[PDB]
Structure formats: structure tokens, C-alpha cells
Point group: C5
Chain length 310, copies 5
Amino acid sequence: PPPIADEPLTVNTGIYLIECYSLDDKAETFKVNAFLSLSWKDRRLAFDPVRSGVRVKTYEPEAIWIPEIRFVNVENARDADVVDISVSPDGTVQYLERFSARVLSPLDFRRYPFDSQTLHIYLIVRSVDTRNIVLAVDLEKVGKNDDVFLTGWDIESFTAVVKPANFALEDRLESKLDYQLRISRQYFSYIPNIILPMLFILFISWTAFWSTSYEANVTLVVSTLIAHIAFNILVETNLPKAPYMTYTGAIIFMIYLFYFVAVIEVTVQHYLKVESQPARAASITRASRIAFPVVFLLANIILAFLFFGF
Amino acid sequence: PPPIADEPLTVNTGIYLIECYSLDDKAETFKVNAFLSLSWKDRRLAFDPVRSGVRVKTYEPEAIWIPEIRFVNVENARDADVVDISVSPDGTVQYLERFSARVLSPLDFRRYPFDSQTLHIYLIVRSVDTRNIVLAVDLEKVGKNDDVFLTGWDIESFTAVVKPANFALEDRLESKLDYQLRISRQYFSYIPNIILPMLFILFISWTAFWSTSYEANVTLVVSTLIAHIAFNILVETNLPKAPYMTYTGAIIFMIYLFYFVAVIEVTVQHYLKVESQPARAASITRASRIAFPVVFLLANIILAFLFFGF
Amino acid sequence: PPPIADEPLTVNTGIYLIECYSLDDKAETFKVNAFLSLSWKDRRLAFDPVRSGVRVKTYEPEAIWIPEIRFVNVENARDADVVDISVSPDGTVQYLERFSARVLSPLDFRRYPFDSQTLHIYLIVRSVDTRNIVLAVDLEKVGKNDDVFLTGWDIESFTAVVKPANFALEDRLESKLDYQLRISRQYFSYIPNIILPMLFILFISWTAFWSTSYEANVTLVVSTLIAHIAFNILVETNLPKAPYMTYTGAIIFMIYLFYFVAVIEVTVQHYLKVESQPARAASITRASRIAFPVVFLLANIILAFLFFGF
Amino acid sequence: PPPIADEPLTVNTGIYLIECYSLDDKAETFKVNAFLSLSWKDRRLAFDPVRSGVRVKTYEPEAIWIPEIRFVNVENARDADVVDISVSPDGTVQYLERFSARVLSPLDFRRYPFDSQTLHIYLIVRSVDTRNIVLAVDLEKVGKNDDVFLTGWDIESFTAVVKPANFALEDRLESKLDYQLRISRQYFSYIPNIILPMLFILFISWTAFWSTSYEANVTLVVSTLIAHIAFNILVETNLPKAPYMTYTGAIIFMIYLFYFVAVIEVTVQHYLKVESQPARAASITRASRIAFPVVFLLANIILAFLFFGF
Amino acid sequence: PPPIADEPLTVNTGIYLIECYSLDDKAETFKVNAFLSLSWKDRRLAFDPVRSGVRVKTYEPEAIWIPEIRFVNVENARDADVVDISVSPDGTVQYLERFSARVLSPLDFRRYPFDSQTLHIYLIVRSVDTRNIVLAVDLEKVGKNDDVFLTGWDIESFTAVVKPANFALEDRLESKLDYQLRISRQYFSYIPNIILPMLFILFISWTAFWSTSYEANVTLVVSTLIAHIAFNILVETNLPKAPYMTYTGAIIFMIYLFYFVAVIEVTVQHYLKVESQPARAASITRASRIAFPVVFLLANIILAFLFFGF
Ligand SMILES: [Cl-]
Ligand SMILES: [Cl-]
Ligand SMILES: [Cl-]
Ligand SMILES: [Cl-]
Ligand SMILES: [Cl-]
Ligand code: NA
Ligand code: NA
Ligand code: NA
Ligand code: NA
Ligand code: NA
């Protein structure tokens, strides 16, 4: 039994995160636990303060018409819990439910682990005989609790995009609001834990340039290679899967390339040394001791700018 | 209390994906979150616009007969949410529920990671005293939302196969519709991440052909073999299990074969060298330097065509 | 209010798999999704075709007495969905529910991966004041849909054991039916993927018999041993846990034993060589080159016959 | 509306395992699927066989008072299914529900994998105006079905501790029964699969005592060490986490200790050999060949007795 | 229909843990299973002992007004089970529900594995027309059962912070109580299992200082490095992820640094030895034999005090 007038029905909305948690780099989901507040005018139940004697009349949710507001990108849907319904005398209604759901918002890993992310929660509502339109009420949207935390993330802002995106769908108007939680990573623990050790084992491979022992050099470059892969296995947990070209793992790919040309160089210095041209081998080796770090530092700089300064 | 006439009851159907997600290579399932729209004529509740005054009369789902449409291939069944029921005056009914479920559609991994897939969602309905037949209404079947994404997949099309497959079952006619979501993989991130490093460590093994040091050669070919398996462990996540003959992993099997014959060759060049026939050893080695890459490039071509050009 | 007569109540039963899936080697469970059909005579609701005018009278499940048929070996119990209830005029009732559950059927891994399995679904019903007995109706038991698949299994048959096992339990008769789904594995993908590479790395270890270099030989046999264990880690997923003596893994245990005696032999050839008896060392080595493969092929044959030909 | 008399209300109880499954060494839980039978006198509904004509009067659970029996150590609580309620003429009531839950019973891993375990299921009931006391009825407690199995365990007994533990709690008496399922492990598959290979790779390390090659010896002892850790990773699944001092893993710790002193000995024999005291090196080596196995066999015996014979 | 008077409504509260379990270092959650007791005055249902004849009048929860107490930091919300409602004659009500939930309390890993933790459970209640305030009743808050256990933790205390934190929220007063479970780890099993073996493999690397064999030394330091990473993979389960600077893993980072400078030193002693300055190499080596352990023991002491003595 929807409210009736010549105007489209506006429904004021407001999310308020009590807790957010379980960001899931793999499923691209994150759980949330929040208030939802709806508010809309219904003159059919507008009432008299004086004859009834009360400032506000509460109602059970079964009793009166309530718009079908729905989340769009939510798996584990319909976890709801009505907390309050308060009808104002002029017929404005104030609905307030607690809810929680696992939202599905895609993440972009290209600048990992310096990425920022912007999680989304959509709300549609579908029209009936009246057209229906949602819109954000900022006093009740200010959705961060001070206590919200994503471990390993700094939480920038929770705000709504004030203009609803109205559109046709299966022969009805539908109105969709977009709430956005913005976050950025706590990278620094990764410097001690991921980048530095990989670099150390790479440098250990570069030691081979001061050796002429082909036996010591294969044992060097190849044993550091095994160490490299084993270490990559060790941190496999902090290197989430993407079908796209990540920053980390561009530099990883580049590191495997350095293992390969280190092996090429070692093999060359040895073939050269056995073809009785020791001067060329010692020159290629003495050269590599400068060449390898430098092309690395350069390729690292190109690569950083390509992802960040671009 | 089903509607009655001399004709079989046609029920118009339409799926509309709001979100699809959680494709699961292991369980061969994927979650979906969509509209379902059913529509069918029931003259028993056909009514008068003039005497009742309204263009359309909505009903609670308990109130009137509703066909038992059911998904066939769905674990985590019965996640339903009625959104709209609108009865036209001629007795046509328009049902619209939001639902989500994890569909069970088998995947074919033979051309991984260049595979395309075609996910399926079936709908049966079972006959009563009236025969019953489902059929697809394209205006409400156009099921892709623009926002649907399978991370790492390009989503080609969501369409329904318009002819229902009617058939006897436990002494009743049953009618089954087939909706099909079509997808194809985002392979390219795999070239930097999977294929190139395996190739580099294999080439490092081929370095042994320029060495005559049996000590350096065992250390070479066998340490690169350990590196190879360790790397395979590293990418174990991106190589899903099949009971059948995959393209990748045909080439992987072939790589293990190349490690084996490299070891055979190394051992031969060394036994030959100790039997005082150094010319045969250096000829077998100098030969291997061309033979190995070439049979590889050839075997790779045969293998590519066998899977793709066949 | 159970039906009454001087006879024990027979209830005709019939399972019909629509889908089976998620065979779980670890939990020894598998999910299923099927029809259940019950059928039994109740003269109390037998009725007149002529005075009532209809061939069959349908009933809501709340309305009439329905036997408590129950699955025995089912975790995630009670996922039910009544589809049809049709009462015949003589009082026979035809019940038909769709259901799904995860069945608990033990698997036997001794001949893995050439094993066949025979999954079980039990049905008990418990007596009241009337004795009660289940029995299988083959027209509705023919439970395979053509579309059922267990990925990596060929599905032989779905049949029921026609004689119920009646027995006393907590002072009541109980009757239990046994339905059996029979399957056999798709082994062949395992030959390229598991057996051949293990064999290659073992043969690489046998290469040591053509070397006299103790340095090269320890590096050989022990680096192939590390490769072995790393490879075992790689295929750890396809080697399910058992508390019993599996075929695969008998041969695996035997492979570790071959690494051990290869190390013993290498060490012996070297101690012999340093005790200035080179003729014994070269004889033991030249002997091993035949002895190792042959005792392997023999032990493999004994072992195959012990598990298969026994 | 509880039954009233001058006596405390005794409630006879009885669990009957239909299936037990999913023992979880990690969460320290195990799933169960059983009957529960309650029985208690209620003269308020005692009735006349002659005037009513029936030997037993069944009731719907809503209709009559039923004690709040509750499991204590259960996550995934309240999975219930009433099967029977039968009231005797003198007012004794016989309740029977099927249920399943995941019970939380701590495991003790100190003698793994020769451990036995004793799983617990508690039942409290809380007092009202009448005091209330549970007590076990053995005819309906005999809870094993013949078909119960924990894969890899032998199931000794399912019995109840007949004396309830009554106690004050939040100003009411509460009565708690303790049912106990007793089990012991199937260790033997572990001898081929875990213990023997670790021992083989350790013995391979001991081979170094017959070599004087410091190059061969480091390659030996350290490559077997890497093999060891890799093997430990391989069986990581069968070595469950404890915050306490396990038997296995005492012996593992001891094995790492043997790797360490083998390295110490090897380094010593080599420093001695370069300080031109070859006699002391060859004596320390020739000594180690007996010392290492023996201190091992001894330490293994001490360690076995400390855990088992103590 | 809330109780009315000129005063704010105080609601006495009390949690009582029956079981706590499944502490989850990864999700930073832990499950709990407890009593909740609410108590508050409602004169509207105050009653006469004499005219009604009973000391206490029990009520069904539907029948009377009950405050909306709610947990704040709880995923898997609303697992409730009313156990008792007892109204005193003066109108005080005594509510008692059993519940269980997975609480979300952040953990601090900086002093792992010597950390203590302090888990939190919050309770808000929201005001209506009356202001509403929660407060803790210690006789029913004494929440530890003697049987509570977190495996691997010693459980210090379960207490409540007696002063509620009242505050404005969405135009209502809200009152929030804070219950705190305090725990501290069982570290000692980690000394045999994690710290000692890492130290052993590190010391094995330090053996290289008594060798001048560059072949033996690369094989030494680098093979121990691989061993190190493999071992880190073995204990990866007991080293939970943090975005911050942990104590363990500061020492791990420092260990990787020692591998790196051991490689540097080895390479230097070898380049020095080939530049025909053997005295500098043997001095740097003989120096390292004291320098490495000592800077380690010092760095370990600095690092211990920085985390613990600071
Ligand atoms: Cl050399
Ligand atoms: Cl050589
Ligand atoms: Cl040698
Ligand atoms: Cl030596
Ligand atoms: Cl050297
Ligand atoms: Na890992
Ligand atoms: Na993996
Ligand atoms: Na694995
Ligand atoms: Na593992
Ligand atoms: Na691991």
C-alpha cells in the first residue's frame, strides 16, 4: 500500500559502519557491519499530536508500507535486524536497521603494495505505480565509527555520492546510490619482510663476478636461484593473484631475468676462458660488476615511474 | 489451485545477472546474483479496471498460485526474495524475484590458459494435472548488467536457448530451459608470470652443453631441475587439477622430458670422454646445442597445433 | 494418525540423482542432489472418483500422515523441498520431494589411482504402533540422470539393494534400505603428471653408477633426492591420506629405499676405491648398473600383483 | 508449566551416535550425528487407557512442557529434529530427537601418533521453581551404531558417567551429564610414510664419516639437511600443532640436533686435518661412525620411556 | 511499551563464559559461548505475592518489554537462546539468555610469541523516549567457568569495566559496556620447535670461517641459506601476518642480514686470497669467527630490550 501524491517518492538514506572487516584480496570481497537509515514522507499515517498525546508513534515493520531498498553487490544477502521505526506527525517515517553483509567490490592491484583502494556499496530501489528515488542524508551517512579498522590499512573516508543514478530496467525506473569506503595500504612492514631479503639473495648471485671458478659460479648463481624461488614461495601469501600487470612482480619478473643473464655471463666468461682468450673473459666479468647493479637500478627507476609517475 | 484451459500452460521466464562472482576452478562452481522474472496467464484472477479502479493489482505470494520453477544444477539452493507480483486485468501475472545461488557448471581445461568457458544455469518445472511448459522472454532475459565481472575473464554474452527441452520424468512431463553465460580468459598476465620463468630455468639447464666439466654439469642440470620443481610449486595455484589431457602440462610434461634427456646427454658426453673418444663427446655436445632448442621449438609447435589448430 | 490394518506397512521408495558432486577424498563425503519418491497405501483417505469428480486428489504435506523416512549417513541433514503429493482413489499415496545432502561414505584407497569406489546412501524408517518396512520401486529408483558427472570418475551404476535390512533398535523394529552409486577413477592423466616425472628423477639418480667422481655422485644422488621430495610436495594434492597400506606410496616408499641404497652403493664404491681395491669398486658399480633397474622392475611387479592380482 | 511434586525432577537421558565424523586436530572439534532420548514423569498429563482406549498418547512438542536440556561444549548449536513424543498413562514422557553438532573436546597430542583420545559431550539442564536433575538410562545410552567410524581411529567405547555433576550457577542449581567417546589411533601407516624416510635421510648424513673430502662432506651433511626440511614440509599435514611437548617432534628436535653435531664433527675433522694432526681427525671420524648411531638409539630409548614408560 | 519514570533506565548486565574457543590470529576473531544476564525495574508489571500466591512470576519473552541490548563487535550476530525470565514483585526483571558469537577483537603481535592479549566484547543499547543506560552486576559478571581454555594460552581474567561509555549517536543517547578477557601465550614449546633449529642452521653457516675452500664455502653458506628459507616455510604457520614491526621477524630479518654479510665475507676472503694477500684474508676470517657470534648476541640484546625493556 505505497504513499500517494503527484511527486516521485524520495527516500532519504544513510549508512553507518559500526565495524568493517575481512577484506579478502582473493574473493575481492569484504565484510561490513553497519546501520542503515531510511526516511520518507507518508501522509496516510500522518497523525495528531494533541488527540493522541504523543510526540512520536512507533510501529512494527509488518504494520506499515516500507520501500524495498536493496544492496546490489552483496553475496550473503539479507542479514537484517530492525532497530527502530518512528513516525513523525506530518507523516515522515524514520526507519533504522542494523545489518551486516559481505560486499563485492573489485580491487586494483597494479601498484601493490603502495595501492589505495576504494570499496563500493550500492543501493537500488525499484519503482512501483509511483516512481521511486533514493537520496543521501549526510547527517546519518557520516558512517565511520572511530573504531573501524582494516588491519594493515589506513581508512581515509566513508562518504556517499549524492546524486542517485536513475535508469530504466525491465520496464521500471530504478534509483541507485553509491557509498564509497576509501583505504590505502600499510606498506612499510613489507620493506624488511619482502623486498630486502629478495635483494640480498640477488646480490649474493652477483658475487659470482669476482670469482673465476666456473664450479663455484654455477653453484653460486644456481643455488641463489633456488633460494630465490623458495623465498618467493615463502611470501606467496603476500603476493595476491591478478590477471593484470602488477608493479611488484614486474620487478619480480625482472629479477628472474637478472638470474638468467647472470647465468649467461658466467657461461660466457667460462667459454671465453677455455677458448684461450682470458682477457675478454676478465673484461666481461670486470664490466659486469658495474653493469648489473646499474642496469638494475635503472630498470627499477624506469619501472617505478612507469607505474607511479605515469 | 492451478489455472485451467484446454492448452498447456506457458510460463515466460527471464534471468538478469546483477552480479556474478566466485568462479571456482576446483569445485567447478560459480556464484551468481540475479533477477528471475516469471509471467503466465491466469483467467481465474483476471479482473475489471473500471469497477475496481486500478490499472494493476498486486498480490502477496501466499495469496495466489505460483508455478514451481526450480534450478537444476544448484548447490546452496532456495536463496529467494520476492520483489514484485503484478496481475494484469486479462489474468497475465508478472512475478519478479531476486535470488542468488552457486551454480554447478563443468569447466573444460584442455586449452588452459587460452580456454573459453560456457557456464550453464538450467530451469525445470514439473507438470501437475495441466501440462506445463517454460519459455524465454527476451526483453527480460537480457541478463547482463554492465557492471558484471569475473576477475580475469572477459564476459562475452548472456543469452538463453529459446527452445525448452520437454521430457518425461517419473510419470510427468517436465520442461527445462538453458541459460548460458559465456566467458574467455585473460591469459596475458601469465606470460611474464608463468611461461617465461620456466623457459629461463630450462635454458639455464641447456647451458651445460658449453661445459665439459661433469661436476659443473651435474650441478647445473640437476640444480636447475630442483629450481624447476620449486617454481612449479610456486605457480601450483594457477594450474588447476583436471583428470584429462591439458595443453599446459602437456608442455610441462615435455619439459620434464627435456631435463631427463639433458641428463642422459651429459652422462653420455662424460662416459664417452672417459672411454677415450673425446671427438664423439664433443660432437654430441656441439650437436646438442642446436638439437635441444630445435626439437623443443618443433615439439612446441606440434603440441600447439594438436590442441588449437585441431 | 498412521494408517491401520493387520499387515506391516510397506513404503515404496525411490531415489533419483539429478546431480552428484563434490566428492571429497579428505572428509570421505560427497554431495548429492536428487529426487526422493515415497509411495504407500492409506485407506483412511481413499476416495470416490465419481462423487468428487477428479482422477487424483493432491494434498498439502501438513494435511495427512507421512512416514518419517530418514537418511542415516548424512551430515548437513534435512535439506528438503516437497514437489508433489498425489493420492490415488484406493488410498495409495505418491510423495515426491527434491532434496540434497552431503552423504558420508567411506572410501578405500588401497588401489589408488586405479581404485573403484561404491558410494552408499542409507534410508531408515522407525516403527510406531504399526510395524513399518521400506522397499525399493525400480521404475522410480532408476536414479541416474544422463547429466550426472563426478569430474575424474566414470559413473558405472546407480542401483538399490532390494531387500531391506529390518532390525530391532531401542525397542522398535526399524527398516533400512541401501542405495549404491558405483564409480571408477580416470587414472590416465596421472601417468604424464605423476608417475613419469618421479621415474625420471629416480633414473637421474641412477646415472651415478657411470661416474666415479664421489663429489659428482653425492651431488647427484642427494640433489636428485631433494628434487624427489620437492616433487612429492608438488603432487601432495593428488595423494590423499589413508591410515592403511596404499598401492601408490608402497611404490613411493620403495623409491625412498632406492635412494638410500644408491647412497650406500656410492659410498661403498668410494670407500673401496680409497682402500686401494679399485677392481671391487668398479665391479660393484658395473653390477649396480644392471642390478638397480632390474630389482626395481621386479619389485614393481611383485608389488603390482600383491595389490591387484591378489 | 513444569510438573509439580515435593521431589526434585529426574530426567532420564540417552545419547545414541548414528554417525561420527570430521575429527579436526586443528580446531579440536569433531562432528557427531545422533539420537537424544529424554524421559521424565508428568502426572499432570497422566491419563486413562480405558476411557480413551489407547495404550500410548503422542503429543506435538509445542503442546506440553519439555525440559531445556542443552549441550555445553557445542559450536554450531541447535541443530534439532523431533522424531517421537510418547506419553505413558502414569505420566512418564518419552522424548526422542535426532540432532547433530560439532562438539568441542580438547585433544592431547603428547604421545602422537600412538595417542588415545577421549572425546566429551556435556549436557546441562537449569533449574526453575522445581530443582532439576539429569541422569543416564543405559538401555538408550548404548550409543554406538556398529557403523560408526573415525577414519584412522579405532573406536573403543561410547559410555556415560552415571553420576551427574550438580552445582550452583547464577542463583540456580544446574545438573550436568558427561558422555565419553573413546578412541585410539591407527599409527602403522606412519611407519612406512613418516618415520622411515626421515631416518633414511639422517643415515645418509652419517655417510660423511667414511669420507675425508671436506667438499663432499659439506655437500653431504648440508644437502641432506635441506632434504630433511623439505621432507618435514611434505609431512607437515600429519604433524598437528600443539603448545606443548609432543613425543614426535621431541625426536624431530633431536634429529636437527644430530644434523648440527654432524656438521660440527665434519668441520672438526677438517680443521684437525689442516692443522697437521691427521691421526686425531681419523680417530674422531672412526669414533663417530659408532658414536652417532649409538647415542641416537640411546636417546631414542630415553625419549621413548620418558613419554610412554613414565 | 517501555517502563516509565522521571529517572534514566538502568539495566544491570552480566556475561558468563561457558566456553571460549577458536582464537583466530588471521581474522583477528575468536568464538565465545556464554550466558548473558539482564536485570531492570518495571513497575508496570510489579505484582502482589499474596493475591497471586507465588514468589516469582515467569513470562514468555514475547509477552513483555525487553531492552534491545546488542553486541557491537560481532560478526555471525544474533545467535540467541532465552533460558529464563523471572519477574520480582517490585517489578525488577531478571533475564538470562545463552548465546554464542564470534567476537572481533584486534590482536597486537609486536612481542610475539611472548605477547599477552586483551580480547574485548562490547555491549551497546540505544535510547528511546526514556534515556537508557547499561551497568555491570559483578555477582553475575564473574564470567569464567573453571573449564574455559584457549589451547596455548593461559587465561588471566574475565572482568568488566564498570563505567559505561554513554554518547550521542544519530540523535540518541547510547550506552556501551566493555567486557575484557585477558590472556598470555604459552611460548615455551616454540624454543625447541622454532628458535633453536633456526639458530642451528645459522651456526652451520658460520662454520665457513674455518674453511678456506671457496667451493666448500659457497656450498656451505648458500646451502644453509636454502635450508633457512625452507625451514621458514616449515614454520610459516606459527608466524602470523602483521602490517607492523614484530619482535620475531625483526630477529628473522636480522638473520637474513647475517647470511648476506657471511656471503660478503666469504667472497672477500677469496678475492683477497687470489690477489695474493693471504695474510689479510686469514686475518678477516680469524676475526669473523669472533665477530659474527658477538655482533649477533649484541644485536639480539639490543633488539630484545628495544621491544621488551622499552
Ligand atoms: Cl673452476
Ligand atoms: Cl669434471
Ligand atoms: Cl671425486
Ligand atoms: Cl677435502
Ligand atoms: Cl677452493
Ligand atoms: Na605458502
Ligand atoms: Na602452492
Ligand atoms: Na601442496
Ligand atoms: Na603442506
Ligand atoms: Na606451508
